[PDB]
Amino acid sequence: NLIPTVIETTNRGERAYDIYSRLLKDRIIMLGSQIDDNVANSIVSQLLFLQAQDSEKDIYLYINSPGGSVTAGFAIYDTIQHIKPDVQTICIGMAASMGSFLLAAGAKGKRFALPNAEVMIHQPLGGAQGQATEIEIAANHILKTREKLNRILSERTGQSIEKIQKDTDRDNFLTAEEAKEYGLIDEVMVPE
Amino acid sequence: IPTVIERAYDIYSRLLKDRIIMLGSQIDDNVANSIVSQLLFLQAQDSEKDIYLYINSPGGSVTAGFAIYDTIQHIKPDVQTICIGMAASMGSFLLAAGAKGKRFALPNAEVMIHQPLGGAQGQATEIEIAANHILKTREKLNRILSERTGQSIEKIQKDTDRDNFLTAEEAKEYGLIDEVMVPE
Amino acid sequence: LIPTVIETGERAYDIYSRLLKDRIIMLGSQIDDNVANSIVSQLLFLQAQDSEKDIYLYINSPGGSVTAGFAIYDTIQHIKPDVQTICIGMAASMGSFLLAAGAKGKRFALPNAEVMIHQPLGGAQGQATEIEIAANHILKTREKLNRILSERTGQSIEKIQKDTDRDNFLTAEEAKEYGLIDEVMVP
Amino acid sequence: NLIPTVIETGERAYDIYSRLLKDRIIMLGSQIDDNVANSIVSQLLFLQAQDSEKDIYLYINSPGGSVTAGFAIYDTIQHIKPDVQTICIGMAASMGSFLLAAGAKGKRFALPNAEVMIHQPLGGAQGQATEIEIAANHILKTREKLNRILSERTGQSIEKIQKDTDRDNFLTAEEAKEYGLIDEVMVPE
Amino acid sequence: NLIPTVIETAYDIYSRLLKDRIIMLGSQIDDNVANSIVSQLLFLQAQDSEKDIYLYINSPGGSVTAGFAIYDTIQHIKPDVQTICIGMAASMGSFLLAAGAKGKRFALPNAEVMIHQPLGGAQGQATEIEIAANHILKTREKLNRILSERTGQSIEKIQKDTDRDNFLTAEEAKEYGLIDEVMVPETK
Amino acid sequence: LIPTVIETTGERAYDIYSRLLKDRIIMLGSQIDDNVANSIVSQLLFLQAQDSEKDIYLYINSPGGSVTAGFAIYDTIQHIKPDVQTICIGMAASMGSFLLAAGAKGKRFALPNAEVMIHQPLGGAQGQATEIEIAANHILKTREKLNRILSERTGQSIEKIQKDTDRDNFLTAEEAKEYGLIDEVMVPE
Amino acid sequence: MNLIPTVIETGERAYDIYSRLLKDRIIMLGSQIDDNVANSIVSQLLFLQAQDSEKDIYLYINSPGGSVTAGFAIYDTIQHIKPDVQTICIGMAASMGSFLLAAGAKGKRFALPNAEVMIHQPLGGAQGQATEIEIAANHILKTREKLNRILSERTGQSIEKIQKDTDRDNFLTAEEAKEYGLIDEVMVPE
Amino acid sequence: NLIPTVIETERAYDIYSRLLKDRIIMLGSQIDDNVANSIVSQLLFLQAQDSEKDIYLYINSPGGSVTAGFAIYDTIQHIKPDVQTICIGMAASMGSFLLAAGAKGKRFALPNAEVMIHQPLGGAQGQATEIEIAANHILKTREKLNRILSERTGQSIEKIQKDTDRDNFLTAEEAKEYGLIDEVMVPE
Amino acid sequence: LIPTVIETGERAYDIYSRLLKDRIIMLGSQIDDNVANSIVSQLLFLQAQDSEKDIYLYINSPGGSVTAGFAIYDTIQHIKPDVQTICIGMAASMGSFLLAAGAKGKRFALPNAEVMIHQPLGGAQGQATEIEIAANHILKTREKLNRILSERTGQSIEKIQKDTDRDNFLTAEEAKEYGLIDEVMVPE
Ligand SMILES: *C(=O)[C@@H](C(C)C)[C@@H](O)C(=O)N[C@H](C(=O)N[C@H](C(=O)O)[C@@H](C)CC)C(C)C
Ligand SMILES: *C(=O)[C@@H](C(C)C)[C@@H](O)C(=O)N[C@H](C(=O)N[C@H](C(=O)O)[C@@H](C)CC)C(C)C
Ligand SMILES: *C(=O)[C@@H](C(C)C)[C@@H](O)C(=O)N[C@H](C(=O)N[C@H](C(=O)O)[C@@H](C)CC)C(C)C
Ligand SMILES: *C(=O)[C@@H](C(C)C)[C@@H](O)C(=O)N[C@H](C(=O)N[C@H](C(=O)O)[C@@H](C)CC)C(C)C
Ligand SMILES: *C(=O)[C@@H](C(C)C)[C@@H](O)C(=O)N[C@H](C(=O)N[C@H](C(=O)O)[C@@H](C)CC)C(C)C
Ligand SMILES: *C(=O)[C@@H](C(C)C)[C@@H](O)C(=O)N[C@H](C(=O)N[C@H](C(=O)O)[C@@H](C)CC)C(C)C
Ligand SMILES: *C(=O)[C@@H](C(C)C)[C@@H](O)C(=O)N[C@H](C(=O)N[C@H](C(=O)O)[C@@H](C)CC)C(C)C
Ligand SMILES: *C(=O)[C@@H](C(C)C)[C@@H](O)C(=O)N[C@H](C(=O)N[C@H](C(=O)O)[C@@H](C)CC)C(C)C
Ligand SMILES: *C(=O)[C@@H](C(C)C)[C@@H](O)C(=O)N[C@H](C(=O)N[C@H](C(=O)O)[C@@H](C)CC)C(C)C
Secondary structure, eight states: OOOOEEEEEOSSSEEEEEHHHHHHHTTEEEEOSOBOHHHHHHHHHHHHHHHHHOSSSOEEEEEEEOOBOHHHHHHHHHHHHHSSSOEEEEEEEEEETHHHHHHHTSOTTOEEEOTTOEEEEOOOEEEEEEEHHHHHHHHHHHHHHHHHHHHHHHHHHOOOHHHHHHHTSSOEEEOHHHHHHHTSOSEEOOOO | OOEEEOOEEEHHHHHHHTTEEEEOSOBOHHHHHHHHHHHHHHHHHOSSSOEEEEEEEOOBOHHHHHHHHHHHHHSSSOEEEEEEEEEETHHHHHHHTSOTTOEEEOTTOEEEEOOOOOOOOSOHHHHHHHHHHHHHHHHHHHHHHHHHHOOOHHHHHHHTSSOEEEOHHHHHHHTSOSEEOOOO | OOOEEEEOOOEEEEHHHHHHHTTEEEEOSOBOHHHHHHHHHHHHHHHHHOSSSOEEEEEEEOOBOHHHHHHHHHHHHHSSSOEEEEEEEEEETHHHHHHTTSOTTOEEEOTTOEEEEOOOEEEEEEEHHHHHHHHHHHHHHHHHHHHHHHHHHOOOHHHHHHHSSSOEEEEHHHHHHHTSOSEEOOO | OOOOEEEEOOOEEEEHHHHHHHTTEEEEOSOBOHHHHHHHHHHHHHHHHHOSSSOEEEEEEEOOBOHHHHHHHHHHHHHSSSOEEEEEEEEEETHHHHHHHTSOTTOEEEOTTOEEEEOOOEEEEEEEHHHHHHHHHHHHHHHHHHHHHHHHHHOOOHHHHHHHSSSOEEEOHHHHHHHTSOSEEOOOO | OOOOBOSOOOBOHHHHHHTTTEEEEOSOBOHHHHHHHHHHHHHHHHHOSSSOEEEEEOOOOBOHHHHHHHHHHHHHSSSOEEEEEOSEEETHHHHHHHTSOTTOEEEOTTOEEEEOOOEEEEEEEHHHHHHHHHHHHHHHHHHHHHHHHHHOOOHHHHHHHTSSOEEEOHHHHHHHTSOSEEOOSOOO | OOOEEEEEOOEEEEEHHHHHHHTTEEEEOSOBOHHHHHHHHHHHHHHHHHOSSSOEEEEEEEOOBOHHHHHHHHHHHHHSSSOEEEEEEEEEETHHHHHHHTSOTTOEEEOTTOEEEEOOOEEEEEEEHHHHHHHHHHHHHHHHHHHHHHHHHHOOOHHHHHHHTSSOEEEOHHHHHHHTSOSEEOOOO | OOSOOBOSOOOOOSBOHHHHHHHTTEEEEOSOBOHHHHHHHHHHHHHHHHHOSSSOEEEEEEEOOBOHHHHHHHHHHHHHSSSOEEEEEEEEEETHHHHHHHTSOTTOEEEOTTOEEEEOOOEEEEEEEHHHHHHHHHHHHHHHHHHHHHHHHHHOOOHHHHHHHTSSOEEEOHHHHHHHTSOSEEOOOO | OOSOEEEEOOEEEEHHHHHHHTTEEEEOSOBOHHHHHHHHHHHHHHHHHOSSSOEEEEEEEOOBOHHHHHHHHHHHHHSSSOEEEEEEEEEETHHHHHHHTSOTTOEEEOTTOEEEEOOOEEEEEEEHHHHHHHHHHHHHHHHHHHHHHHHHHOOOHHHHHHHTSSOEEEOHHHHHHHTSOSEEOOOO | OOOEEEEOOOEEEEHHHHHHHTTEEEEOSOBOHHHHHHHHHHHHHHHHHOSSSOEEEEEOOOOBOHHHHHHHHHHHHHSSSOEEEEEOSEEETHHHHHHHTSOTTOEEEOTTOEEEEOOOEEEEEEEHHHHHHHHHHHHHHHHHHHHHHHHHHOOOHHHHHHHTSSOEEEOHHHHHHHTSOSEEOOOO
């Protein structure tokens, strides 16, 4: 479809801004889609840009995502942890799979979800075809990746790896209040 | 899409400048992303001045509607909902979401409401989880509509079992809107 | 398009059915549940007709389903009659496995017939739990395939594993040295 | 239309190919796959079981097919006690030309306007470099086997076969006789 | 048993006509059809080597090599093969119509005959295409050589006439030397 | 599913169409192509071989089809000794209506509610200007042949047939009688 | 116009986020490597050298690889140009992407703590005559030898070891990639 | 990340057009008429801008249309300015032909770039006459291609023919000895 | 992807607009109604800008719609400025026809450019009356094409018909001798 342009007067002329770009000026990043390499490349670039303009002031990341590539999510995750500013994460709609992972990845004390926003967690998925040697390698890799995913989730939520392992066997849906109890968020955002 | 100059503005961008957001498309994650951005943008400009949201939608993703819904309730400015054409499913839900006393539907606009849809395919354990998640989502959906309209949860449940087509006057009677817009 | 013969009352056999009367089974296609179903039926019928006399199985197969291949293998070993295996064209994958399954001293390949051996293939899609189960099943099936080949060729499992890692093409003489067959048929 | 039926007198009916099989005549008029090879081999074995002395006539009008399927047929021809006469009608190309040369020596025939084609085998290689290397050696080794057998059965040198089959090589009935592919260009009897 | 008789797809109508030494061609000439026609010619010779065979042609042609397989079996077999043209004998069909026994090639009053040069295809390298072009030219040379012998026309004339599509009536086809006579309705 | 009938001689099965062939009835219920024409011609030639004296009944319910395939049927009808009776049921159109007129004179019928359609032949030409000219000349000459024969069999002039077949002309049973395509309209016995 | 329109992602008439990073000499590789992607990256490297030959260039790689020749076009340019190219791995560097990660200025090749590095042998397709397949097999075998030779020089690993480790897919952590010699330092957040 | 943008502090450039300003033309596609048109216009544009200064053409091309390559080739040879050809990644088929087309002394390939030479491919479908014409054209076009290749490398036409029968892959050092390039580009 | 040229306010031009500013028109595609419209509009624009100064038309076209080419042809002749036609790569069919249609003494082809001439193609489907009308049109249009080509080249209509019966491929020198072009462009 179409996204609106916001035009505003500057010191040296009139700037036409993309609506997301306009929000970007106020240090707001909107993730509203599945996470692939192109989406991860965008988000990382926005994060690196926001640090370059100001390394002290906070960055707000809105997360409404069904997730996508794990590696693409890890590209985003590592960038969040590496940059100097605190990245505030706000869940609206649904933050699932990798989206739930990135929501819990925000600055501790600054991870929020909106009252009717949903959070879901589950174990990762993969594919494997060809020879038995090739399938074993792919099988060992997805199990090794899952161990890393559970371990980081244990650090973020405060829940044990064994609990994370048990609670992600099948899809698990949570409320904003149930997500706060789990340790995925800090506070449910209250109307202002 | 036509362009107007003052600064060259497209027609939707020109109306955004006067705090008007047009939602004529189907509600997906992309559309929900854009509406939330516009709502947050208009609050930053002025937190007191109202915003007008025209609704002409057959709905779409339930969670995507909730992203818009929770943003409407969260922000300081009052959001007015204006129904033109048809507000069905999640679009009707977003119409009821407008600031109380400021929800209108136009005389010949149609309002349709019904229960949510889903897909569950795979093992019996996986189907049960998908079945329980949709059933809990509907309860939440019914519970919110109860509060917006004043109708009982059990009534909302019974009425949304099948497709329910309501006129502008019928929608007002239901409490989905406050007034019917008078030609002036 | 396949010819019919009439043996003199008078009753009509198709060309393959006629050879089954002389206890000859033609496997000349990919091995699936259907083909395995047909081959097993022919093995059981021929045993019921006569328990003592030898059965001749011609193999020209790229292979196919492993379990379907095992349905044939187990029937071959179970029945009382000796099943001679003759390789013409190509016995690859499960075909080479079924070729080596014949009665010892009675496994043949023709002079220009080819034999291919390699590790099995699989497909796993879904959750990490689902993939672990699938990988464990495929790997364990390979162990089963390797130890049976060890028993029938005399080669060690370490050699079978090493030599089946990639596609391995063998001539009739090379297969005999390996122990997949006993003799190379001569004109 | 179709393939006609013949009745011999109770009453019995043959399809036209099945009637010819009675007189030890086999028709190969399609691409050579595993099914076609399977059918052809069985007919050779059935005819030998019926009589191991008398000659078999195999008509060849084939564009070729699988090399392994052709070798299944080839190896059966050499194995059986009866001589197999090869008759080329229309076109014998690739593996079809190879099988025409496979016929009993002194008994390979082609009709006056029948065409014979010889060329190197085709293949496919996909995936890893190690996987490609293995497939390349197999097609190369199989080509050497095909060229070696062709040299033995025509009288041309291996190096000449290699050079002549590098590209598509078209031969007339006389040219096939000169090449040693057939013994005689069958002329009207 | 008695074999069930049927019209199409069992004892079909063609099998019943085959008893009286009549071979019906009402389709494209490909390897399947060539193979079947050839088998019928060989079967009919085995039954009787003296009695004449009747081949009705209503074909638009097909594979050149398929035509030659039918063509050469016609020339080799001892019995006379009479060619009757009904509807249309085009391309390899018209070539096969001229192949019939001399004095015994007929076409019906409104039967059409078409003669034209052979078609082909070549894809790939310049060496690959050169070989394909050389093969198609040599095959065309062979086609005109044989037609010349059958028609009585010169090779040079055949080349000119079959350059483009050449539609001939039954009377025109007789004039050309493709057929011996036109089967007029007034014959008992 | 085409039902079959069994009769005693010994016991012989017939499909319904070949059972009707025993009483010299040929059914044309399909669009005329080279396969259909090949079947019809065979039935006409088989019936002559059985009996030269007795009439043949050809029911026609066809939209038409290939002109050359229609001419193969037409020419065979005129060549054989038996009179061919043409009965129209449902719709005889295009090439089928032409074949309806081809019946033995005084023995061409249409049933009370059967329709007849006549029109000029269709065609296709795609290529060079030389190639289109030849195809265009061929189609126009073929139309002359169709109109000349229609003029002879019906009784109308060539100029009237040319003008009436310019567009699609739909005729009833009574109109087809008056035009000359049939002789009588069948009545319930 | 006095000023250019600003957009994040994106005919194109605007100032996208990647261009703003390109002003600070940063190149974002976040896709599979084809000739189109290679062309743009090479153009960015050549442009950045022209602006300032002394200052460093930062190449972020999140790639599964692609064309070997397209990867080599990027590779040769990195080595040819005067400015140092720092390579940073985020998410995944696999195949030709891991090769380009090794290609960065020695002492300036980084990976993020949960970034993955994957190395394996090249892939190909060959369909046709036995003569034609032989050429394709020889060409892919020579290209693997070239790839292994360059990786040996870059990582400090022996050619023999590279051949063995790349026979099948080989998944490495950021620490394991550092020990291999593919990177220099794991960019730890602390 | 697409084809990014460069801002001159406003003036906006896409990355390739910015390099065009500094006389650098990027060819990294299959060569077809649209591509050929873009290259030619760029070459004529740069000639019109200045007639003395060199033009740099980077080649990462698998090949393309032969006539479209010649459109580019002939424009290069006609214009006053020297055009330097730089091979990055792969210069195959016509890409290798255009690589040899550069100003002598100024034809470079990077150390790990690949050069590939082979005979052209064609298509011929239809009548035997049409096939003969099409075969003649592509054989004559191949004669033209080898002739120009011979003139620009110093190799005999007989050698070029033999070397382009099948796909021939050459290294950057190997291309230099052949005469396809002058020097292997060395790091600074 | 076409590069942008910026000339100094400051103006943004795509590469084809910048060459259009210097009276150069690029034709490097199939000739259809859209292309022809764009080509014709450019010619009218350049006459409006300057009636006296010469226009340059680069042609790399395989052909297209005959009527669309005539819109270009008739506009070329009607306008006051001399239109120079330069064959780059390949001018085939209507592209060749338009090449010869340039101002006399001002029509060129580059040393390795190709020119191909042949008769027109058509499609006729439907009723016999409809086929006749379509066939007459193709035949009238061919005669119109041959006559104009005869006038331009100076060759007889009889020779035109004979040379365009099949595909005819001409070298740059052979195009000059034929009279399709006046001179072959020599490198500077
Ligand atoms: C959540 O967003 C999951 C998707 C919605 C399915 C996501 O976490 C996920 O697991 N994605 C899978 C993935 O990226 N797998 C990769 C891979 O197979 O390459 C590795 C993590 C496997 C170890 C997608 C669906 C393949
Ligand atoms: C109205 O717009 C509804 C339909 C489009 C008519 C909409 O509310 C709806 O039910 N959407 C469904 C949906 O979001 N389903 C999700 C899902 O399974 O992903 C369920 C979780 C909702 C309970 C779409 C049609 C799937
Ligand atoms: C040889 O015939 C093998 C292939 C056809 C090349 C055959 O042995 C084989 O591996 N078949 C595979 C198979 O049956 N896989 C099953 C399966 O995943 O269902 C595995 C359990 C076997 C270990 C086919 C190709 C899937
Ligand atoms: C002639 O008949 C050849 C082709 C049909 C034209 C035939 O000899 C041939 O090369 N067949 C190919 C073939 O069997 N290739 C096998 C294979 O791919 O397994 C190679 C092992 C042969 C060396 C078919 C067309 C693949
Ligand atoms: C008439 O029957 C001709 C065609 C139906 C138009 C027939 O003679 C013909 O041209 N057949 C072509 C053919 O046999 N081509 C082969 C080939 O491509 O291999 C050439 C060898 C024939 C010289 C068919 C239409 C391809
Ligand atoms: C009635 O059946 C007519 C068609 C169904 C429309 C039939 O008479 C007819 O015109 N058939 C066309 C035909 O055979 N055309 C051939 C041809 O193009 O080869 C012309 C030679 C006829 C003059 C069919 C539909 C092509
Ligand atoms: C990693 O990026 C590899 C694949 C994309 C997974 C990459 O190294 C690779 O193998 N690329 C292959 C390639 O470039 N193959 C060419 C070719 O056959 O054209 C070979 C010449 C390389 C030696 C692609 C995937 C075909
Ligand atoms: C290398 O670029 C070659 C191929 C793309 C691999 C290229 O030189 C080539 O052969 N191109 C072919 C071509 O342009 N053929 C023309 C044509 O068909 O008009 C012939 C006249 C060339 C003799 C393309 C691939 C068709
Ligand atoms: C050259 O460019 C020719 C073709 C494009 C190869 C061109 O001259 C030509 O024949 N064009 C055909 C054309 O426009 N035909 C019209 C038509 O059928 O409408 C005829 C009236 C022309 C006499 C195209 C290919 C249809």
